[PDB]
Design a protein around this ligand. Structure first.
Ligand SMILES: [Mn+2]
Ligand SMILES: [Mn+2]
Ligand SMILES: [Mn+2]
Lengths: 344, 345, 341, 341
């Protein structure tokens, strides 16, 4: 075909989703974890449960061993604080970059630009399966249009990144997801695009997508009424009760339930991980004082605090954004459970 | 799984549309020559102006071909000064919801006859290119480009998707030049980052001409540039052009810009495109070399109309954004040509 | 794995169907002929089904000139004959050389199968669009999706009548299907095949999208035997009566199509005229079980070897009668059908 | 179009079965060794006998694994005289209609759960190979081979498909040796032709491991041999073996045969397999080096049953010898091998 493929270097074979679903099917326990966590979050979003959704874990997964260890520690906190918090592990292996960089465990699991994406999908699905099988629900970022078919059945909640909240193809994707979805405000703090995204994702759509068989097809979606905003900061943080009030009034003006998830990290801590503890103190004060609009928080936490460059790597340390460590993580979760107790 | 997926329906693979509607020799020629002419402008070796002009959206092949004949005659008449490419946009990004264009819903009745839309779209693109008129499109969808991209001489990544990794990846592998619009709030940096990302090779998941998903490796696309489309305020004036030139150079990129006369640069007021035109013409004729292109929303008949009314549609008139009509279009093209001649001295 | 040397891309059927869709005339031709052949197989029509044309197609130009000539005799003899043109692309062999128009359209072992499917479908479309129905041979489980909508009648080869995979295929074809007796002249494998093919089946098959899938068939009640000879010819009254008995003792209608060529002519193309004379005698004498015949026929008689330019309109596979004998043969059959009533 | 196609349902691609059920280290070695061993026998560089033995058809994985454990013992005990390979036949060719085997209908109830069939068949095949017992099957379907062939040590083309181009093409690209059965009427020629065709390279349409149709090119299979299985009369006697050794040379192939003790050789009477075994054992004992392998229909319990519930260990297709006769037969074979030595 003339005029075609000048800038396409190579085309390589990709396992279809059914190969990964057949090799790694959901166990009864894993399926039960997903189904109950989705239902619990739905109940929170409808305002029929005063517990707080807590999405917490590494910025990115690069080592499944450290991830399973983290998951085990977090599951104890989950069972302990279950009357106040719906704790969901952050399991992100699809990173959005400002220009170029490691896009995650799926795109390059060996972290060396070998781009063994078939291996990455196997590793990623096995890890998600093991975590859900242990009883801990998982949350992911939906950046790619094709990877969700391999993993979405093991996801109890999802986030559309700030860089794609305005994008029609991602609003389309959210409209057909089986889990609830958070939309981050814009990388410059724009709330309008996330409200538009929630309204768009709530409506039915018809668009082209790839099936479990690895074939493109026409898909029709129902619309996703389990979508909400995530406050992530802009040029300035936006977690204070002042910003919440403005965000609540905008949601209502737009006909949307006045509820928000607050990300303690990213632009809300100015990309310095220790200040997540500060945001926590502030957010706990709002909740404890009766703020019922705060239905969720997101925290970047790992076994070992800080970060490291892909430049021997340290264990349980982030290779992307800096995270809090486990002792801080333990205290942060109890603070929120206590703040939820007070609000009640 | 599939709780919110209502129905899944069969989709013709790209090779089916390619086999039914192959490029003629002259259509392939139109595309190859326009892509090369744009590359030459982008490298600084040609002092002509790229003009991407035509309907906000295609909804009627009949009016689109009548428009193309008129524009082709001016493309020929003004070719020493302008490289004229027709906007042939089959996909529209909506602020929230609405008609997504001819491919998604060709019958404009929410029947979503996408296989029909792909047939109509490629046939029209083939006819326009075969007449001698190159075509431009917005690359919004991740799967439709394999059906159409061999007939596109230039593509745009919209304001709402310039920051999106999968769109930057797509551009890194397209065979045509690509413009990146600034952010809907006016932010320049997202488009500069996009140019740099698109110029690098990538590895990502995509769909082949056989309709199967695959791993793809791109070489990177060096024929990318920024499109100024305004923000909270318009950004076409010399003060803004200067800041963007400096921002590109500081990022190691040639100081070159395409200026969209419409969208936020006209405050969505279609006749103000003529006012942007006057200002941009004065910049070009006064000596501004960085303005390598413009974009204009233009139809046979000015204004727009609504599909929601159920009234029979008027001929040659946009059902999306309001456009200038043919008479203004002719005048505007002659203004731009006169300005490019004056810039040469 | 280790005996698979290379895998190349193949256009899916839907690509050929989009490029070459059936015209209204073509679909009408296929519809009318399939119904007419059904009306004959059900005993409700007394005309003779004549499948006639080249042993194999290797040149679309000669094939369309042949179709023009045959169409004229189709129209003139329509009161007696249901004339269907033989549009076969290959000579099922063991290896020899040429592998057929689809496999090797350029006749040079380049195996440009994508080119061959385009050429083969376009020709079928043109012939049907002109009003002339087409008959084909099903030797492949994947080719049919690209061409079967343009076929009014199909044959299963003698080397595959016993194959479960080919009987499965027949059970889902939209056209009548003829099963040849065995290369040795046995009728049991073809009665067994008519029975298997009349039953529903479930099997794996490639769809129009080029993807394998599970398919269910209704079973094909429009199947019949083709008498093609064995060690000796088997077209005579003695053999027809003997096959009728086998068909009756099987629950199947006592009806045959007789191939004048292949083993029945002792592989001597001119002897097809001798078979014609005999069969015309059976038919004029009142034999109603002969519902159809098959004839290898081209513009120019005889055959030629593929090496260098080729003679126009002459087979590069088995030898055929030429047009002069073909016109006389068809008129003999028409006359015989008349005398039968 | 598709007016005889009732329904089209989704089918897992082979990569999906290959990913769920990958070959273990052990299973991979079982196949690698057994294929090498058969090649060495087929090249004349090993005096042992290839014994393809097991049920006519697998229909119960549980009974099949018990059988496999019993046969594996005899495989180790008799390893210096015999190279023993399980029959693990998942596909059965019918004379007309009937149960086509475990893959086509694993629940034996015309529900055609072919995705379940393929998971069942592959898991059983994988377990058997992992224990150390090589496996054999008939390659009948054109699409199922991609799901199983990496676990096959030896394959068979049935008598009703020996003449089929598509099956000879399939044979030319299989990574395992292939035996070709003589025609059902006993015709030897079709089988020699098939062996010649399969040793040659071919280009044809097939389905890949991703479930997509494609153009494939094969190298040719040199490890092919004839399988004598009777026709009108049995053809296992040294008279018939003589004629076949002669007919192979006349065609330029090695003079070596496999003898199937069942089907038309035992007149479809399973006890007669012991009589064929007596006769064939005397040919071996008497020095016949051409008999390189034998095929035997064996199950845990002799006889067969119709398809109410099913008796344990009894074939639901052709009648088989029971396990007591199987141990006896196998030791008869190993004894004659030590005699010929
Ligand atoms: Mn982060
Ligand atoms: Mn517009
Ligand atoms: Mn012939």
């Amino acid at each position: 075909y003339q005029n075609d493929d000048l800038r396409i270097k190579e085309i390589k074979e990709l396992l279809p989703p059914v190969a990964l679903l057949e090799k790694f099917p959901a166990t009864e326990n894993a399926a039960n974890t997903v189904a109950h966590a989705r239902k619990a979050i739905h109940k929170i979003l409808k305002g029929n449960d005063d517990r707080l959704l807590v999405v917490i874990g590494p910025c990115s997964i690069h080592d499944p061993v450290a991830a399973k260890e983290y998951a085990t520690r977090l599951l104890a906190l989950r069972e302990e604080l279950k009357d106040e918090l719906e704790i969901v592990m952050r399991v992100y292996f699809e990173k959005p970059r400002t220009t170029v960089g490691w896009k995650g465990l799926i795109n390059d699991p060996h972290m060396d630009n070998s781009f063994q994406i078939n291996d990455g999908l196997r590793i990623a699905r096995k890890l998600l399966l093991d975590i859900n099988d242990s009883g801990l629900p998982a949350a992911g970022e939906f950046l790619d249009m094709i990877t969700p078919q391999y993993l979405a059945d093991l996801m109890s909640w999802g986030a559309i990144g700030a860089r794609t909240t305005e994008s029609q193809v991602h609003r389309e994707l959210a409209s057909g997801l089986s889990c609830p979805v958070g939309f981050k405000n814009g990388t410059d703090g724009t709330i309008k695009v996330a409200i538009d995204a929630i309204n768009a994702a709530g409506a039915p759509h018809c668009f082209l997508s790839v099936t479990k068989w690895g074939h493109s097809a026409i898909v029709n979606t129902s619309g996703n009424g389990d979508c909400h905003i995530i406050l992530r900061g802009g040029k300035e943080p936006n977690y204070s009760a002042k910003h919440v009030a403005e965000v609540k009034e905008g949601l209502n003006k737009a006909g949307l339930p006045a509820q928000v998830m607050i990300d303690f990290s990213h632009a809300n801590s100015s990309k310095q991980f220790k200040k997540q503890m500060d945001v926590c103190a502030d957010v706990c004060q709002q909740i404890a004082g009766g703020e019922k609009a705060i239905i969720g928080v997101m925290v970047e936490s790992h076994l070992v605090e800080g970060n490291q460059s892909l430049e021997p790597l340290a264990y349980g340390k982030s290779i992307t954004d800096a995270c809090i460590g486990w002792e801080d993580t333990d205290a942060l979760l109890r603070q929120l459970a206590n703040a939820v107790k007070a609000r009640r």
